[PDB]
Amino acid sequence: KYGGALPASVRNALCDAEIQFFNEYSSTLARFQSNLGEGGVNLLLHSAPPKSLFVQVRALEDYGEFETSDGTQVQLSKDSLHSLPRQDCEMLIRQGVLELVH
Amino acid sequence: TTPEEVLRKMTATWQNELCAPCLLPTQMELVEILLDQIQGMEENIGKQTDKMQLRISVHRVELQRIGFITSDYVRCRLQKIESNPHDAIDQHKKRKEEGKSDLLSESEMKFAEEYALAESNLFQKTVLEFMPAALKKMPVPRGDHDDVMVYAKVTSDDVGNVAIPDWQDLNGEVILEMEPESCHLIPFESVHQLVEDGNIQLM
Amino acid sequence: MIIEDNFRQEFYNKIKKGDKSVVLIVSVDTDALCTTMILTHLLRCDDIPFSILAVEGWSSVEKIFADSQEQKCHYILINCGATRSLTRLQIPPASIAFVIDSHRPFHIENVYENGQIHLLANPSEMSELQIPDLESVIREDSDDEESYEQRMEKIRRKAIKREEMQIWERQRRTILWRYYESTWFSSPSCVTLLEMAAEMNRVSAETMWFTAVGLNSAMADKLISIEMYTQICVDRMRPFVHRFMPKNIVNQGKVDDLLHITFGRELPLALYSHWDLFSAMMVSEYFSIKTKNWTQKGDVNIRHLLAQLGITLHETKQKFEALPTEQRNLVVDVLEKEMDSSFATFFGTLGYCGKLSACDVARAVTLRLEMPKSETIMNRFRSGQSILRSSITGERQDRLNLNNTFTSICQRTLQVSWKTVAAAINQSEIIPNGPYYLFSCSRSIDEDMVDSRHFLYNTAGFMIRAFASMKKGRTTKPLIAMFPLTGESAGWLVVTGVMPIATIYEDSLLKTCIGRAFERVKKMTPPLRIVDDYFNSDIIRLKSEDRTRFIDFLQTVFEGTSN
């Protein structure tokens, strides 16, 4: 869910053995991910069938300078609209920096 | 063999893997070929000086589709392994003893062993170290896919006959004929071998 | 630099070649919204990444430029940037600015920048702008620095050159003082982008509809004359109409699933087809001035007028949708012949859904953009975008949102403006103050509406003609209006003004000078607490304490121009 991290409100409910289990499972999953192809694969990407190449997004906070995979710079600042490639900013959509605009 | 054939085989594998209730023999070879093809096309586009033209967009959308297929296949198999890791290792060893094709690749087997150890640690620290000495063994459930149904379509010409349980008399069994265009509602264990051999497509 | 031709090669290809990052800076108004809607479609066809920023004051543009000194950008400025020198704002040294703006005149420094600035102009507009030649306004003043007899000769030549420099400066100050005489609006921006997209063959009914809405917004906001609107429709818009007509009616009358656009006659009433005709008439300028309905005799006058025209009271007082079609056509013919105007507009139809008018959609988009000021600027921008997209679909929820927008705030704005004018006349708020008339309130009826350009321009233009109809000899002076604010802007006033009724325009352009008068009031000493951040020069904010000194200073300016 979202990015791969536990909320503080969830972590306060756990015991130490469960926290250890989360860290062991995350390390095992990353180690498996590193062996796919040459450079590894992020399995949180392509979570649904792709509808289009570009997405329209609204920036929710002053993240600052960002760069696409083609080397184009973008200045993500609060209350601004962008049109970006989907693969590049899917992670920021998951982490809550951007939201989709319909 | 062409990449145009490899992708077509991979799509049918993906559909069967989504529909089947348990773990099919592994096909990571096709995944590795298609990932290498994605990387080669990416570097070839990177050598271009002009990118605002139609060809580059068509190529990039095709790479998007192939990446979706491979990622969804690997995610489905990992979610199947996480439900019961010891049973997966047991079935792989039994197929190796029977001399059949592999159930798990090397990386999948390594992931299964490491996840099994990580899952064992939590139970040992929470409960099992406090038990009396007789009750310190780790429980592992048996398999659960006994009464599962599927929708199945026949594609090969010469499939032959299939046996199913008899609900009028469960001591015995009933024999069915599979004509080569038909669709059936049928138990999975009757069609398991044909799904492995590729003579049946699940729906 | 001014670009007058060849816009695809001069402007679009330089963005398509992708060396720098692409930013749009947009003024928050309806015409700018429609221009943005066309331009981003053209970019998304070619898969160019871009970003958008919305502004409503010069200080926001200053902050955007100030934070960006290390970047490299193609800036595109929409309905802002023409009337102040951009180089005195901190343009980043590596970036380029393109300006697409309908304000006039261009600032002379923006005209004669070396090449960091490009200004797009309408076809053949250079023949009318009458910009001064370069050496009369810009000079290499750096080069003014420079035996006994040779020393004396150098003293003589320095005296000669200093005197000729002063002669040239006197001519230059006269030329610039006449150049900055007035402000005015040229053609709307989105027509140019429609013409540009027609070259690329990426024009459709949606872009045509957006252009029609953007053109009608300038008419509804009292920015351009009816003659200029008619000329734009005859010249530039007519070649596109036959493309999108419902000519599939020839194919067995078949109602297909596509948007179709037609052009034709229309009643100039505000919201008559989404309302009832009596209520629509009683808030308009024309029928209010004709019947004098702020007085006691207004109800009797309008009843007698309807009896003369031949329309029943029940027909006027039921909802306009309820009438049969032939009865509707008869009533619309009678009222069109009564109002006697040359107005015509565009209609859009989609399936079995109700027909819409571009003028009505323009009013809805404007009132969702500009109000209320307690909401954030991006939220107002997104609301206007949603309302504009709702007009090109047959979906039930979208059409329900559009009808709610029609039947609440569009009605309420007209009613509040009429109440303001009626209270002004009935309690004699308008007084002479020398060379101009002055209007001031005890309280404003709704302070969310006071800061809107649409509300201010429409209300003041109605008020001066209503005041001048009561008594003869009132046509030769301008009107100045002041409204107070409360709450978080307690102690402030909003100030604007309107030209005299008797003014004659040499052509269709509607030039005004009252924003220039306010601007020259600001230069006087000791300074006054005036805020001048808006892109429109004839709207300002003033501290409540400086009202008396402001009245005296503005009288000094108008008297000094009378001298």
Add this chain to the structure above:
Amino acid sequence: MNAERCEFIAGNSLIEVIPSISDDRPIHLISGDIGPFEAGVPCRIPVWTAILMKRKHNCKVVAPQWMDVDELKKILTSETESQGLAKLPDHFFEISHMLVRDAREDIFEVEAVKSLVQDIYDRRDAKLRSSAIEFLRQNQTCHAQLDNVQLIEASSARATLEACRQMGAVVRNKHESTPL
């Protein structure tokens, strides 16, 4: 498996378009070569590529032959007369919905085509409902034949699989309870 993945598989079909752009070389996709393009001369490409070009105004889509009104009437006649499900073209409903969504300008006799497709869907839905209801009264067998079912029709009807799995447990309990 769900409707989005059904549409994803349906995108791999081939369809004919007429370009307005032109190009010299072929395009070497991993799924095979598709080019070259000449303006005004038709050629066959995948459906996803056709929709991608149609959004960019680079082509005109030519509808399939089974979207003719006479052909749709033939399909409706056969579906009405047959007791079981009649045979259809591959990915019939998915391709119909995709083309009505993205390319309805190029379809001819659009409302009649749309109404005929809705009629075919309505009565095939009723046939599948009646077959499943009649199956769930059974106790003697755990098998049925469902020839010419589409993939999206199979995807929408997965409650029957769960119901049959639940029924099998009670049948097995009765068999184990039979005395000896």
Add this chain to the structure above:
Amino acid sequence: EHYNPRNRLKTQIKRR
């Protein structure tokens, strides 16, 4: 030279 997937597949067959 014009890129083609088949040459890439032949190179990977030689690699593996």
